[PDB]
Design an enzyme around this catalytic site. Structure first.
Site, short mmCIF file in Angstrom:
data_model
loop_
_atom_site.label_atom_id
_atom_site.label_comp_id
_atom_site.label_asym_id
_atom_site.label_seq_id
_atom_site.Cartn_x
_atom_site.Cartn_y
_atom_site.Cartn_z
N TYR A 27 11.92 3.46 -0.77
CA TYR A 27 11.56 2.70 -2.08
C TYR A 27 10.04 2.30 -2.14
CZ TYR A 27 16.39 2.04 -2.65
OH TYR A 27 17.98 2.25 -3.08
N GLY A 29 7.20 3.99 -2.99
CA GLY A 29 6.88 5.12 -3.68
C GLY A 29 7.34 5.23 -5.00
N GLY A 31 10.22 6.99 -5.82
CA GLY A 31 11.54 7.09 -5.55
C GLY A 31 12.27 5.62 -5.60
N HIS A 47 11.15 -5.47 -4.99
CA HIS A 47 10.22 -5.32 -5.79
C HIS A 47 10.40 -4.24 -7.20
CE1 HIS A 47 5.99 -3.69 -7.50
NE2 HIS A 47 5.80 -4.97 -7.31
N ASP A 48 11.28 -3.27 -6.68
CA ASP A 48 11.83 -2.23 -7.79
C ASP A 48 12.92 -3.04 -8.58
OD1 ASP A 48 10.38 0.02 -7.48
OD2 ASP A 48 11.75 0.68 -5.89
N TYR A 51 10.94 -5.53 -11.10
CA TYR A 51 10.46 -4.71 -12.05
C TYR A 51 11.64 -4.38 -13.26
CZ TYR A 51 5.63 -3.92 -10.53
OH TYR A 51 4.21 -3.92 -10.39
N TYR A 64 -2.99 -7.46 -15.80
CA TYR A 64 -3.09 -8.92 -15.64
C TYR A 64 -3.70 -9.50 -14.92
CZ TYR A 64 -0.44 -8.24 -11.13
OH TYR A 64 -0.36 -7.94 -9.86
N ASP A 89 4.73 -8.88 -7.96
CA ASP A 89 3.62 -8.26 -7.29
C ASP A 89 3.40 -8.97 -6.22
OD1 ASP A 89 3.88 -5.97 -8.80
OD2 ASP A 89 1.99 -6.32 -9.71
C1 LIG Z 1 7.25 0.69 -8.43
C2 LIG Z 1 6.59 0.80 -6.99
C3 LIG Z 1 5.26 1.39 -7.25
C4 LIG Z 1 4.57 2.02 -8.53
C5 LIG Z 1 4.29 1.36 -6.28
C6 LIG Z 1 4.60 0.64 -4.91
C7 LIG Z 1 5.87 0.30 -4.82
C8 LIG Z 1 6.52 -0.44 -3.45
C9 LIG Z 1 7.06 0.06 -5.84
O1 LIG Z 1 7.96 -0.33 -5.58
C10 LIG Z 1 3.58 0.66 -3.85
C11 LIG Z 1 2.49 1.60 -3.74
C12 LIG Z 1 2.25 2.42 -5.32
C13 LIG Z 1 1.87 4.04 -4.72
C14 LIG Z 1 0.85 1.17 -5.00
C15 LIG Z 1 -0.94 0.52 -5.73
C16 LIG Z 1 -2.46 0.71 -6.41
C17 LIG Z 1 -4.00 1.07 -5.67
C18 LIG Z 1 -4.23 1.31 -4.14
C19 LIG Z 1 -4.77 -0.22 -6.16
C20 LIG Z 1 -5.56 -1.15 -5.57
C21 LIG Z 1 -6.66 -2.02 -6.12
C22 LIG Z 1 -7.95 -2.45 -5.35
C23 LIG Z 1 -7.54 -3.52 -4.11
C24 LIG Z 1 -8.65 -3.51 -6.25
C25 LIG Z 1 -9.91 -4.05 -5.36
C26 LIG Z 1 -10.57 -5.00 -6.30
C27 LIG Z 1 -11.86 -5.79 -5.67
C28 LIG Z 1 -12.93 -4.66 -5.04
C29 LIG Z 1 -12.57 -6.68 -6.71
O2 LIG Z 1 2.81 1.71 -6.26
#
Ligand SMILES: Cc1c(C)c2c(c(C)c1O)CC[C@](C)(CCC[C@H](C)CCC[C@H](C)CCCC(C)C)O2
Length: 121
Positions: A27, A29, A31, A47-48, A51, A64, A89
């Site tokens: 999960y 990712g 998928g 988390h899914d 969402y 946000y 999140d």
């Molecule tokens: C649906 C679903 C999605 C879509 C998902 C994940 C999971 C568990 C899900 O159940 C986890 C991983 C990924 C592939 C995730 C995260 C995005 C990047 C690493 C972003 C990070 C941003 C950084 C810190 C910002 C830092 C800001 C400071 C420098 C001010 O997205």
């Protein structure tokens, strides 16, 4: 969005969301099938589901804002969607942190074909 979620994950786990949690288990990712491999994977399952209960929003895309008070994440006042996405999140980032003790490297780069079966939320 992935931006805010990734930031929470780094702040709570000390790990970069991508690639540490972007290919984990069934999960963590894109998928969404089969039995979660472990606690961390279940965090993603939940988390899914969270969402999935925001049909009136765009969880993975909507931007946000949030802040940290007394060392903890605080979802600031915004639109209903923004606030809910933030909470989904936050719960997940904290879930990852609480379960780092069982985070297993072997579940990284997990192939989706190993995940089949409908698992209800
Ligand atoms: C649906 C679903 C999605 C879509 C998902 C994940 C999971 C568990 C899900 O159940 C986890 C991983 C990924 C592939 C995730 C995260 C995005 C990047 C690493 C972003 C990070 C941003 C950084 C810190 C910002 C830092 C800001 C400071 C420098 C001010 O997205």
């Amino acid at each position: 969005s992935l931006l805010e979620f990734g930031k929470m994950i780094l702040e709570e786990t000390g790990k970069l969301a991508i690639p540490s949690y972007s290919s984990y288990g069934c999960y963590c990712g894109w998928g969404g099938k089969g039995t979660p491999k472990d606690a961390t994977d279940r965090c993603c399952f939940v988390h899914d589901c969270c969402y999935g209960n925001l049909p009136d929003c765009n969880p993975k895309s909507d931007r946000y804002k949030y802040k940290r008070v007394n060392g903890a994440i605080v979802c600031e006042k915004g639109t209903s969607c923004e606030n809910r996405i933030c909470e989904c999140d936050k719960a997940a980032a904290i879930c990852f942190r609480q379960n780092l003790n069982t985070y297993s490297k072997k579940y990284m780069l997990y192939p989706d074909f190993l995940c089949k079966g409908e698992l209800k939320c």
